[PDB]
Design a protein around this motif. Structure first.
Motif, PDB file in Angstrom:
ATOM      1  N   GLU A  31      -7.223 -10.231   2.773  1.00 51.67           N
ATOM      2  CA  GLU A  31      -5.897  -9.834   3.227  1.00 51.67           C
ATOM      3  C   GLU A  31      -6.004  -8.992   4.492  1.00 51.67           C
ATOM      4  N   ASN A  32      -5.132  -9.274   5.455  1.00 51.31           N
ATOM      5  CA  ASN A  32      -5.112  -8.542   6.712  1.00 51.31           C
ATOM      6  C   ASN A  32      -4.272  -7.281   6.555  1.00 51.31           C
ATOM      7  N   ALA A  34      -4.595  -5.015   9.329  1.00 51.58           N
ATOM      8  CA  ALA A  34      -4.481  -4.559  10.703  1.00 51.58           C
ATOM      9  C   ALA A  34      -3.106  -4.912  11.252  1.00 51.58           C
ATOM     10  N   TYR A  36      -0.429  -6.177  13.924  1.00 50.41           N
ATOM     11  CA  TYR A  36      -0.400  -6.971  15.144  1.00 50.41           C
ATOM     12  C   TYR A  36      -0.267  -6.048  16.348  1.00 50.41           C
TER      13      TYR A  36
ATOM     14  N   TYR B  24     -13.479  -3.502   3.374  1.00 48.04           N
ATOM     15  CA  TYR B  24     -12.777  -2.836   4.462  1.00 48.04           C
ATOM     16  C   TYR B  24     -13.527  -1.566   4.830  1.00 48.04           C
ATOM     17  N   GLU B  28     -10.891   0.489   9.678  1.00 50.02           N
ATOM     18  CA  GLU B  28      -9.779  -0.418   9.422  1.00 50.02           C
ATOM     19  C   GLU B  28      -8.699   0.256   8.588  1.00 50.02           C
ATOM     20  N   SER B  32      -4.920   1.034   9.486  1.00 54.18           N
ATOM     21  CA  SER B  32      -3.890   0.389   8.678  1.00 54.18           C
ATOM     22  C   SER B  32      -2.527   1.022   8.920  1.00 54.18           C
TER      23      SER B  32
END
Ligand SMILES: *[C@@H]1O[C@H](CO)[C@@H](O[C@@H]2O[C@H](CO)[C@@H](O)[C@H](O)[C@H]2NC(C)=O)[C@H](O)[C@H]1NC(C)=O
Ligand SMILES: *[C@@H]1O[C@H](CO)[C@@H](O[C@@H]2O[C@H](CO)[C@@H](O)[C@H](O)[C@H]2NC(C)=O)[C@H](O)[C@H]1NC(C)=O
Lengths: 49, 50
Positions: A31-32, A34, A36, B24, B28, B32
């Motif tokens: 799962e992202n 970060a 955009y 992660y 990161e 987040s």
């Protein structure tokens, strides 16, 4: 009167045939989390009196 | 030749190396958040000197 005998050989366990494996190439995605990210330009004028 | 022996086959369990793995990284996780408060502050407190 009393008469006994020797036990005969036994059936030994068969060695299991075994697992079969499929060779392959794999790419694991997650799962992202970060955000955009994109660059922008701001235009404004500071004013004071 | 015939043999009176019974075979038995033992192979040692080979070595295996464990490489470090992370789903992660903490960078990161810090990224987040949509707005890192510290970086916003540092950017916005440079307006007079900029
Ligand atoms: C993996 O492939 C082998 C290939 O020989 C399979 O061998 C089978 O062994 C079983 C015994 O459980 C027999 O019933 C089959 O007839 C065998 N098949 C063949 C084509 O030889 C083996 O079973 C396969 N993997 C598994 C988990 O069964
Ligand atoms: C004794 O050890 C293993 C079985 O546990 C066998 O060695 C492997 O055999 C496979 C085929 O079954 C070969 O592809 C490998 O090269 C062998 N070595 C390893 C490290 O896997 C070996 O054949 C057994 N001995 C006998 C007489 O079968």
């Amino acid at each position: 009167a009393t008469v006994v005998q020797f036990e005969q050989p036994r059936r030994c366990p068969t060695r299991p045939e075994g697992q079969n494996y499929t060779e392959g190439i794999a790419v694991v995605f997650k799962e992202n989390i970060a955000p955009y990210k994109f660059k922008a330009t701001m235009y404004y004028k500071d004013v004071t009196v | 030749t015939v043999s009176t022996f019974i075979d038995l086959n033992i192979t040692m369990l080979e070595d295996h190396e464990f490489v470090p793995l992370e789903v992660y990284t903490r960078h990161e996780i810090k990224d987040s958040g949509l707005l890192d408060y510290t970086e916003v502050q540092r950017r916005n407190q440079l307006h007079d000197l900029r």
